[model samples]
Target: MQDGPGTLDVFVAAGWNTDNTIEITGGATYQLSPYIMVKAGYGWNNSSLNRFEFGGGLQYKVTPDLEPYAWAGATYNTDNTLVPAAGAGFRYKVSPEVKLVVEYGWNNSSLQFLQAGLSYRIQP
Candidate 1:
């Protein structure tokens, strides 16, 4: 989740709207003795009449510095959009604490697109 300070989960004309999105996402990974592991997660979004989606993915790592992953997900919404909700991508470790990823997601709407993103491992 990302947002500025003092922002609440809400819907307003000039303010940040709920966008009609409610979802639950979680992933699990295991220690294959120690150096290697596997992971997965799921998510859903609905609320905004125009924005609705669902997705999930898998990840794996063989060492602290080298990791690879693959995933596929789908999204759908009201009206005729650009693309269907299905695609795949992978993530690579940039450092012990961060990773870089390239991903693709499809929308049933008129505009399908390839997606890319990054992740950070927050230390406790």
Candidate 2:
């Protein structure tokens, strides 16, 4: 009973960079159609949100729980500031409400980051 009509899942992650900065990001994904979905996120750095990054992407479900996506977007105080980014990853569903994510992403300016997070779903 996950993707009924319009399934929405929210996720949050904690990460680190070679720059030694701690990052936290929170976002949500919405199943727009049977095979297509849209998502957006906002990130904070150093636990103070001294920096912020937010982007939206379109994803295709290759399998029931696997998604590969790409898009172009911006960052408030990060590399390139605004550039095209792409990533491919799958969030494994351990339960109806809990999923695991570890995503690899990069932009034209060589800004690369990984996301290891938890996703929780809600649809009623």
Candidate 3:
């Protein structure tokens, strides 16, 4: 999708986790600039763990179809603590409407995770 103000991105994913937990995630991103975006998301597992996150970050186009980015955000969980988190990732545009995403991130509690998903872009 074209990156600019008014573009919206939505995604949903399932992850096989090391702890034998199946993770489900979904999110939305809004392009605030041709090179910047803001995001919000939700994640959950069979164990009843859930979290909500919100953040924004920058993107650099490495090629017409490849863009990598880094982001920092705050998370709220069922435990009632506010966590600071950061992640580095990239998106590969597979088609005009589909993009592949991969990210690795860590949080203040020393928890680390990897996530991959396909995102769909809706032109606004």
Candidate 4:
């Protein structure tokens, strides 16, 4: 129903995968209604699949600073087909510029990976 995070938001995150195949992804999310957001991302991995992802999902702000979210979308792959993807993660902000994120999700192959990284978030 939306197009990535075209409106921009207070979120910008870069996380690294801990699995045997290391993946690097940086994404941005735009908030709407204070409880939902539109997500979009770019991923680069040591393996063969690397592409741009466009999708959005819902979030629950448990305490404003502690939130959990899940996103479902597809990727633009080298093979020129839409590869489906999705992820579930959380963000905890002890400081405005330093947020912690831990998520596990899947892409085209339906295999999952874990990402734990720091985020540099802007203020709302």
Candidate 5:
């Protein structure tokens, strides 16, 4: 795969719920083993409810095409409140270049949501 270890990924998404928030995130992955990966990323939202999030995650490649991951981080809110955030999800490769993502996450403020997404991977 062109996107092997050390590959960088950048993506953006919008939450179209009641608040209609947008977020952009960029991160790089480092393979710790054939089945383990570690990554860190920065997240920023366009909504006034949240400021920015700094976090890291761990991913375990269960099969060649499916990875289950978990992430935890700290976020700063618009009101200057520090909140702890965490989430878990699975990425299932539907094709060589496409994957499906399903995740659920929550914050210290008890805000929670479920996200289902599709992503594309580029070949080098």
Candidate 6:
């Protein structure tokens, strides 16, 4: 009924404010069943805030093709600021290979970020 038991996604983002940014990240998600998923990812952000980060998230299926997820990850930077984050997002499947997302984040400094994104699953 499906291609396989797991999916992987790669995505990129650009953000601005008083801050400037570019990030590239890739991650994988494994479906334990229809209702649960686990994820891991690595990313680099380039800007005045240079950081490398890793994190995980859990996704719960609210419908057959929609998931509302919350993820937590940590970042370490050149200035030695240790930032921890938690964010919430919605993923909507557009097809087998594509999904749309809207996410909001809060970090240790209370910087609030909102992003609307899309990702392509490249592998099973």
- All-Cα superposition RMSD per candidate: 11.8, 3.9, 3.0, 5.2, 4.2, 3.8
Q: Give me the runs in candidate 6 sitting further than 4 Å from their true place.
A: 1-7, 18-49, 78-80
Give a tens-digit lDDT track for model 1, residues 3-38.
322221211111111343334433333333323333
Summing lDDT over every window of 10 consecutive residues in candidate 2, give the lowest-scoring window.
46-55
CA lDDT of each prediction against the hidden true structure: 0.41, 0.64, 0.76, 0.66, 0.59, 0.62
lDDT of 5 at 62: 66
Cα lDDT tens digits, model 2, 1-124, are: 5546557778787776666666787878776675455666777754432444455555556676666545445556544355345665655667767878777666566656676888786765
Task: Residues 8-122, candidate 4: write the lDDT tens digits.
Answer: 5444344444455665677766655555667677777667767787887666756857778677788887668786768888766767557776777776655577777665534
TM per model?
A: 0.42, 0.68, 0.80, 0.69, 0.61, 0.65
- After superposition, candidate 4 runs with Cα above 4 Å error: 1-19, 46-49, 107-109
The positional error of residue 47 in candidate 3, measured at the CA in angstroms, is 4.1
Ten-residue segment with the worst summed lDDT in candidate 6?
13-22
Q: Give the number of the best model, judged by TM-score.
A: 3
lDDT of 1: 0.41
Give lDDT: candidate 2, residue 62: 69
The per-residue C-alpha lDDT of model 5 at residue 71 equals 66
Index of the highest-lDDT prediction: 3
Top-down TM-score ranking: 3, 4, 2, 6, 5, 1
**Candidate 5, residues 1-124: lDDT per residue as tens digits?**
4565565444333333335554555444444355444544445655445455556656664678777867677766557787777888877778776667666677566656666656553434
Give the RMSD in angstroms, all C-alphas superposed, for model 5.
4.2
